[PDB]
Amino acid sequence: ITNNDDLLIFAKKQILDVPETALTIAYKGKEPVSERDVWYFIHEPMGFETEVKVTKIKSSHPWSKKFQEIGFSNSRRDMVRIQTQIANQVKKASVDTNKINSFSSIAMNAYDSRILTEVVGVVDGD
């Protein structure tokens, strides 16, 4: 990009100016929870009275008697996520260097044609 407004919006997109929070709730009610519904969260001791949008569900079978785990505002850190990020960055770097090897070879290849042009012009000038 060349203008300043696009750079400004890009820079605004490039940083996070709020604490990164992730909420997890153990729910044991009768009403089922879907992947789209937005609930109302009220929890006085933790100072919560808001609307929460579901982003992660770990449900059990209806006959399993177990609780449900529901997430909001992205997920906890975890290591396997970090390893996946590192692996995909490694793959991107590998494809980048594979492409740039061919690009450098072409730069060498593109040199010989211009060398020939210089030689032909030198002969013509003589």
């Binding site: 079978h61 399993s64 008697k65």
Partner: protein, 272 residues
Amino acid sequence: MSDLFLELNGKVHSLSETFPGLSVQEVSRQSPQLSMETAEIAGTDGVIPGMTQFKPFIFSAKCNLQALDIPDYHLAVREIYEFLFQRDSYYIWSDQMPGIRYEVHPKPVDFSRESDRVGLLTIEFDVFKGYAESRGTSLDPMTFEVDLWQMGMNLSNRDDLFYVFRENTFRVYNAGSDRVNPLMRHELDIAMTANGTPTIHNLTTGESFEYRKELQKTDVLLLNNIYPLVNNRRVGKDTNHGIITLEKGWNDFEIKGVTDVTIAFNFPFIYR
């Protein structure tokens, strides 16, 4: 009167005879230790049981020692401790049921010193195979010569029990309390000598074993445990890896593909 006979290192000893002061009062055995694995399914009642097994059980003999004096008491205690506790298992039986023996390992026993020369004790033995067995194999004349009672009649007097056969179809009687399976680390040897391509069918259990090569009379095919051998050489690659098991009671056997067949079964009976 009662006594306990112990067979170890190829010798048979009488407990009341090896130690003159020792006298066996009572002999008993624990019940079969049925073990079972249960799985629970949420939302449904009860459990689903897996395959049942039989854990090692305990054969107990309560006895007393009446020594001549205190040094004799200590000497007898040491002698009993040395004799009973060997590093390998050994067989035991009793006069009440002489036809059945247990292969056991000794258990810790504590002498209850009631007086300066009298001490009560209860010798316990772990039967670690989970079953009792006859005093010998099927081919052993020992097995059918002492006593064996099964639902009323003594098997030592029955004359229809044969374990060497010359025909192609016959019947084999397994007198044990459950089936004999080499896969369960049981003892079962089958020796055959014939001409041709052998094939054994156990119609009662619906099992089959086939050897895919020609055989000659001087060549002996021996199936022991899970291994077939020809002239004491493993030849499992040329067979179907079949396993022949004997069910309770009569098993009908059919031999096909050979002639002049001589087949012998050598296995001990298994009692629960």
